[PDB]
Amino acid sequence: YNNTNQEDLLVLWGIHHPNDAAEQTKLYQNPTTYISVGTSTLNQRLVPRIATRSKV
Amino acid sequence: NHFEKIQIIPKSSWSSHEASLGVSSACPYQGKSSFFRNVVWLIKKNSTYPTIKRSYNNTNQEDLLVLWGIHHPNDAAEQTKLYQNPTTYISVGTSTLNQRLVPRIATRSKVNGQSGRMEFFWTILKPNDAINFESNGNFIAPEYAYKIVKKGDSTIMKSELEYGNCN
Numbered sequence: 038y039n040n041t042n043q044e045d046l047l048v049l050w051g052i053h054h055p056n057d058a059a060e061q062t063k064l065y066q067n068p069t070t071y072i073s074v075g076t077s078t079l080n081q082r083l084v085p086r087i088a089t090r091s092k093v
Numbered sequence: 094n095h096f097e098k099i100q101i102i103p104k105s106s107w108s109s110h111e112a113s114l115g116v117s118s119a120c121p122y123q124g125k126s127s128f129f130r131n132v133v134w135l136i137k138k139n140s141t142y143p144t145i146k147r148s149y150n151n152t153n154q155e156d157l158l159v160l161w162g163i164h165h166p167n168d169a170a171e172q173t174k175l176y177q178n179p180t181t182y183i184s185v186g187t188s189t190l191n192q193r194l195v196p197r198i199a200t201r202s203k204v205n206g207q208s209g210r211m212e213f214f215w216t217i218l219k220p221n222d223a224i225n226f227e228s229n230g231n232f233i234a235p236e237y238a239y240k241i242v243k244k245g246d247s248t249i250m251k252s253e254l255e256y257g258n259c260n
């Protein structure tokens with residue numbers, strides 16, 4: 038997306054950290070994933086993180 | 094103002110990993126070279142290191158200070174020598190924690206004769222919550238943890254002086 042507007046823009050996004058490899062492939066097939074995001078200033082490569090956690 | 098130390102993962106309970114070989118000349122007790130007493134330096138048994146999947150639940154009434162660590166070795170040789178598995182990680186989870194630690198190799202100056210490094214981590218595990226570890230190598234597991242028995246005013250004074258038997 039390009040900010041063709043005149044004012045600063047607050048952009049939000051996210052990453053899913055699943056319970057286990059089963060759920061990872063169940064929902065996305067690909068077993069080893071990442072989200073990379075870039076701007077004139079941002080240089081992010083996010084990587085989902087698996088861990089066994091209490092239900093919330 | 095007061096911890097009560099409890100055992101939460103007994104040392105004797107590690108069947109498919111060597112638990113008594115996690116020791117170092119950098120930590121002498123009295124000749125016999127030793128280690129941090131409250132955590133275990135787990136190591137490969139037979140030639141191998143099965144994936145560990147262990148968890149403690151805080152059935153107590155008070156917040157619990159849990160400590161654990163990761164081993165960062167000198168090189169791939171030592172990594173496989175001690176844990177066989179060449180690509181490892183420790184993942185730790187709570188109702189709030191979502192950690193995946195990865196050992197980091199780098200060539201470092203000896204300190205207390207060791208070029209490897211140990212990196213410790215911690216959390217406060219609320220009553221009725223559990224901490225779930227999973228690992229594949231380089232894990233330094235908890236044995237003892239601390240119940241926070243009482244809270245109150247205190248401070249960490251910095252002084253070279255000693256106890257004065259006074260009030």
Ligand SMILES: *[C@@H]1O[C@H](CO)[C@@H](O[C@@H]2O[C@H](CO)[C@@H](O)[C@H](O)[C@H]2NC(C)=O)[C@H](O)[C@H]1NC(C)=O
Nearest residue numbers: 090091092149150151152187188221222223224
């Ligand atoms: C830790 O152990 C206790 C059981 O000893 C669990 O207590 C249950 O937890 C649920 C959900 O938190 C509560 O709503 C219930 O009161 C408890 N159920 C029963 C049958 O006692 C607790 O869930 C465990 N904690 C975790 C994170 O697994």
Ligand SMILES: *[C@@H]1O[C@H](CO)[C@@H](O)[C@H](O)[C@H]1NC(C)=O
Nearest residue numbers: 108109110137138139140141
């Ligand atoms: C060690 O490894 C071999 C498998 O390669 C196995 O057959 C042997 O019995 C193991 N030893 C013990 C004491 O478990």
